[PDB]
């Protein structure tokens with residue numbers, strides 16, 4: 001009940017629809033001009049953000065202390081408007097919860113809110129052939145076009161949805177310390 | 181974008197979670213003390229409505245002019261509070277649209293909003309072995325616990341979700357003339 005309302009306010013204020021040469025994704029703006037997409041979105045020097053071309057100034061594919069893939073790209077947008085700073089709402093570490101909401105917003109799946117239930121610290125996953133770390137697993141979403149979806153509980157942003165197989169979905173943990 | 185907002189206001193004001201001896205469903209209140217569930221929910225003389233026992237005074241399984249199943253039960257609740265009258269928001273006939281929202285609200289799937297895309301007049305269906313009429317078909321929902329979900333576009337309630345198979349979902353058309 002509350003998770004839904006937090007989720008709507010967050011998406012309203014910080015999410016956008018993004019098209020890359022590789023598909024349509026949900027994008028979350030974090031602070032300043034920095035936003036986040038799944039690594040596999042591979043944004044080029046320009047993206048379509050809500051139907052509008054927007055330059056990308058820099059794009060950092062995140063990896064851990066040994067170079068393992070984290071499956072997220074941080075992008076800095078070439079736009080004058082700043083995002084509402086939501087770093088305070090980011091989890092400091094991998095979070096497990098009994099109930100979470102996955103919020104997806106594209107032209108194909110507009111305003112989609114999915115209660116995903118239990119979210120567990122899955123850890124290492126061979127995702128699309130790529131060794132990936134800091135995965136959060138949940139049951140019951142799992143369709144093309146949903147990546148970038150934002151995983152949340154009341155008052156926290158836990159992750160960004162990056163993959164799945166069957167009734168299982170996987171988010172990359174979205175950690176406060178990634179930002180700066 | 182708009183369909184989502186209409187859908188939230190409708191669920192907020194007219195939907196409830198119902199447990200019968202046969203499962204958990206979304207229930208929509210229509211006017212006065214009359215509400216609607218899928219036929220297969222088979223409500224008895226008492227139901228749990230939002231965690232609270234509520235008497236049922238009468239329950240009518242709808243069929244057409246030749247006795248074909250329509251897969252809906254109209255129930256009259258033994259409670260003093262009246263529902264906000266939404267008969268004005270009901271479709272007068274089977275409606276086809278390119279984009280619709282399916283809204284499901286239970287303790288298991290709270291505050292779930294699914295953009296289901298194209299909704300077509302499927303008509304006759306052998307649903308769970310039962311010959312059923314006035315079905316609306318859409319692609320991409322389709323899980324146990326989602327029946328009773330309310331199918332809507334901006335400003336109209338089209339149907340109530342009753343079945344599915346694979347990536348296909350089916351609503352019973354919710355027609356204005358059923359009420360009175």
Ligand SMILES: *[C@@H](CC(=O)OCC)[C@H](C[C@@H]1CCNC1=O)NC(=O)[C@H](Cc1ccccc1)NC(=O)[C@H](COC(C)(C)C)NC(=O)OCc1ccccc1
Nearest residue numbers: 023040126127128129130142143144145147162163164165
């Ligand atoms: C979101 C992005 C998209 O739509 O693709 C455009 C590039 C999409 C979401 C998943 C598809 C099925 N369910 C989903 O939630 N993500 C992907 O397709 C992932 C893309 C990718 C990520 C990381 C590295 C490289 C590519 N790929 C997968 O999720 C992949 C899908 O495989 C198929 C065959 C089901 C389509 N899944 C995967 O590799 O899972 C391995 C696994 C996990 C758990 C148990 C068994 C196997």
Ligand SMILES: *[C@@H](CC(=O)OCC)[C@H](C[C@@H]1CCNC1=O)NC(=O)[C@H](Cc1ccccc1)NC(=O)[C@H](COC(C)(C)C)NC(=O)OCc1ccccc1
Nearest residue numbers: 203220306307308309310322323324325327342343344345
């Ligand atoms: C909602 C109610 C519920 O959870 O069951 C508790 C009683 C549920 C929703 C569907 C389940 C799978 N996807 C759904 O959206 N509804 C049902 O289970 C239906 C119950 C019912 C309705 C009407 C008369 C009698 C019973 N049953 C079905 O949807 C049925 C499911 O069959 C399985 C094997 C997939 C579980 N589906 C069906 O009969 O479809 C026939 C069909 C339709 C189109 C193409 C091929 C076959």
